[model samples]
Target: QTDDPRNKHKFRLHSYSSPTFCDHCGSLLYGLVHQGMKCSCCEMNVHRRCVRSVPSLCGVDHTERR
Candidate 1:
């Protein structure tokens, strides 16, 4: 995850392309299992199943943006 604390505001729990990881545990994200692509980390991409065991999975709590 990004070390910049300001980046926290840029977090989008529902965004399909927004850089995201386990919100609760802060694990490095691989990708969305429903999207069928690898998660981006600079230039590297990781698989969803690779990080599924992370305790923070589905931990995001966001309100619908208008």
Candidate 2:
């Protein structure tokens, strides 16, 4: 089977009112403005610097549900 990369994440900079953790590194995102990045489709939270290693698993849940 071929291993083509899945759809890339549509990451958008997000600021949190409550404390949020990074999905990639599992560290608390501490900041007021632009705390981290969130995927528009999957709502995956991650740090700005950690986006490089984030996998493209977008919409996997939707496919599984149906």
Candidate 3:
């Protein structure tokens, strides 16, 4: 029930140690603990408030490199 394949996203609280930007808002996730949310299926990182603003595009492999 957690993982979705039909373009649904399953995100969880993440504590980023390095400089990580939000996938939804394109802003830096600045915090000590639980800085933002990250998708478990597609590794999409975003702020807590920007979660709903993100569209469903999970479980698909991205060609872009980090």
For model 3, how does the per-residue alpha-carbon lDDT over 2-31 read when each residue is reduced to its tens digit?
Answer: 973465577777654664777776878765
Clashes of each: 1, 0, 0
**Model 2 vs truth, CA RMSD:** 6.1
TM-score of 2: 0.66
Evaluated against the true structure, the overall lDDT of model 1 is 0.37
Q: In model 1, where is the ten-residue run with the lowest total lDDT?
A: 6-15
Q: Rank candidates, lDDT, best first.
A: 2, 3, 1
* CA RMSD of each candidate after superposition: 13.7, 6.1, 5.3
Off by over 4 Å in 1: 1-15, 31-66
What is candidate 1's CA lDDT for residue 49?
51
**Taking the tens digit of each residue's C-alpha lDDT, what string does model 1 give over 1-66?**
877432212222233654544443455454544432232322223334544443323324567585
Best by TM-score: 2
TM-score of each: 0.20, 0.66, 0.62
Better of 1 and 3 by TM-score: 3
Residue 60, model 2: lDDT of 49
lDDT of 2 at 44: 85
